[PDB]
Assembly symmetry: C9
Homo-oligomer: 108 residues x 9
């Protein structure tokens, strides 16, 4: 007796690691005999929620990436080019770069 969206979230969490749709479906608590078509219909209904959830899991891992990038930028034992790319990366994300393009339209 659980929220249908919460059992859907359990299905999503089980799908994110163990990589099988019907397996996560029955692990979400559905009919084990009416299994392989009902998981397909359920997935085809709530596709947009699944995409938003996957983007949420991507966003959950960003602080690790930030620590990695800063540590590489301040690492004295790294190659010069990799430090330069890390410093460039955080400077770009900080709001500094530029591009000047000149256009010339010779129409016919």
């Amino acid at each position: 007796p659980l929220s249908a969206k919460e059992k859907l979230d359990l299905y999503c969490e089980g799908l994110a690691d163990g990589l099988n749709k019907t397996q996560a479906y029955v692990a979400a608590g559905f009919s084990p005999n009416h299994a392989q078509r009902n998981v397909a219909a359920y997935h085809r209904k709530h596709s947009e929620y699944i995409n938003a959830f996957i983007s949420e899991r991507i966003g959950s891992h960003v602080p690790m990436a930030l620590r990695v990038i800063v540590s590489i930028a301040e690492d004295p034992n790294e190659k010069g080019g990799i430090r330069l790319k890390a410093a460039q990366d955080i400077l770009d994300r900080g709001g500094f770069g530029a591009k000047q393009k000149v256009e010339l339209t010779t129409k016919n």
Copy 2:
């Protein structure tokens, strides 16, 4: 069941074994009329197969996410690879690029 279930079974065989005729004969079809029916059948049902294979491509995204997270968190990986994976998840998380200034000239 419905001929559509035999078609999706045929699509499953096409997704794994890379042969039109082999996936045809695995569906339970004519072994004598082999080159004839699979070509017309495939040329008719293109959109369902394309949607099915794009769904199969999407089926592997948790694996790819786990791989990228592992490369970012693997302590013994090269500096450049850790930096590039971290840049990738930061970009997919919603932290990105920057400015461009335009200058428009026109034909005499």
Copy 3:
């Protein structure tokens, strides 16, 4: 009792595999002496269909490439950068990608 279209499709498959205009022409089951002008005329007549066929042939190979990329992503003994590129590719084709650019016109 064979269709012109079917003969044409056999000629296209033979051109994709046996790599010669006159050779694939006669392998389609045609006249071997009235060939060198006739195969050229036949090719320039049905060019759009041959190109559509070749795109169908390219699409015939996408599951192999899909398996290749998934295998490269799942290989524990592969170089790090290549695994990363394979996973990036699967994430991009799955529908999660790149972002913004700001415009400012000085005219």
Copy 4:
């Protein structure tokens, strides 16, 4: 409640765990997997602003790294050139034209 949220935000930014950073902010320790989800999706924009400010905090370090690489005589030539070009690009001196012909 926002100051306790900032406490939780720093704990999340450094220790990389939702439930642990939740209880490390001085919040309810028993019921974790449900309330942290609602709180996290609730203040998403605040967390994003928090992380973008933290990204901006490291900019002086990056600038110093790039100038050091540009001034190092024992650095490879290609890396020195890329760094000097990079600060020149960020300083406001750059590129040029592209001509179009539309039929």
Copy 5:
């Protein structure tokens, strides 16, 4: 007993294979002694047909290239990056590709 179109076709074939202006000119069957001034006018006259012929000839080679790319994709003993690039290539030409970009115009007038 040949027309201007068939001698032009022989001229184009000789130019595609034997690579010489006077050589491809005379293999079409003209006078070899007073050649160097007239070939410039001839080529500048039928340039577009030669270009279309050359693109046709390029289109003649696609199955060889396709076979090479597929073999590289299925070759297990090839470097990982080249196998990856090849699989990416056939997927891109097959119709599975890229994605979004957001615009932000801070306008002037």
Copy 6:
């Protein structure tokens, strides 16, 4: 006896080199007793000026960069590719390099 603008400039310069916000705050000459809260409010207030200062410092380092790029271009015992990239770069900043695109829009 110096402006809030001069105290802000010293705080920003200290922020350029001196990492601690609170360290750059007290080195700018403010109250050391309540610094860690007041530096947060002060920084969140004057964000645009600090960003402008950092862009000013980036421009402050450009003559060094020009000297390095021209010197690497003039180095007689340097690799060809690096000399080529530097010469290309200064030629591009001088106002050279062209690129043509023909468009065909099928709406």
Copy 7:
């Protein structure tokens, strides 16, 4: 006695091959006492024709390059990556290419 058009073409050919303005100028036959005073202006006169001449000369080498690319693509003793790049190149020049891009415009 020489036709002016043929003489200009000969001067152009000398620039194309023997790499000198004054060399091709004296190779046309011109006033011996003065050349530099006029040759610079003369070159500035027929600039567009010389550009057409060099654009024709680049096209003169196209079948050789095509043979080069086909041989590199079909040579079995070449690196895998170079074989792939050559095959890709001839496939692109044959007319088979790239795909989509999504736009999202936020206003001001």
Copy 8:
């Protein structure tokens, strides 16, 4: 004198890259450094930018001569010579440009 110290301060920044250091090296008041250099630099930003843009224009013949020498040097690596030749041909006014567009809509 004042102009001499103005451009010498910039060349000193080009040589050892520090504003207070180049200010005290330029030959003005050595006693007050951190405030007077800030005011002086903020005033003449356009002047230093124009000066360095002129200095860049001073070096373009060097870049051209270096590139031509790299292109015609017979014992240089092949790829570097090819990149140099491509660059000089591109700046001479010769490049490829094809592109077919197809703009759709959600209706």
Copy 9:
């Protein structure tokens, strides 16, 4: 009488080879004392012509580059990737190029 239009071009040649503004100014036969400012002002006056002249000098070097590229393409002992890049460059210069792009502007305005 050397005209100001042609003497400027001689100064331009001196700037392209002998690499100094004031030195080329006095090497045109000017006052060596009227020095550091006068060459700067002269340069600021005729900037567009100086740029056009250096562009003619840059255009002067294209035949050598073409010779080099064809030589690299024709070298039997050159690396495969480098010969391929040379052939790609000359094919692009001949008029054979790029390919498709699909646009889709689905947004909430």
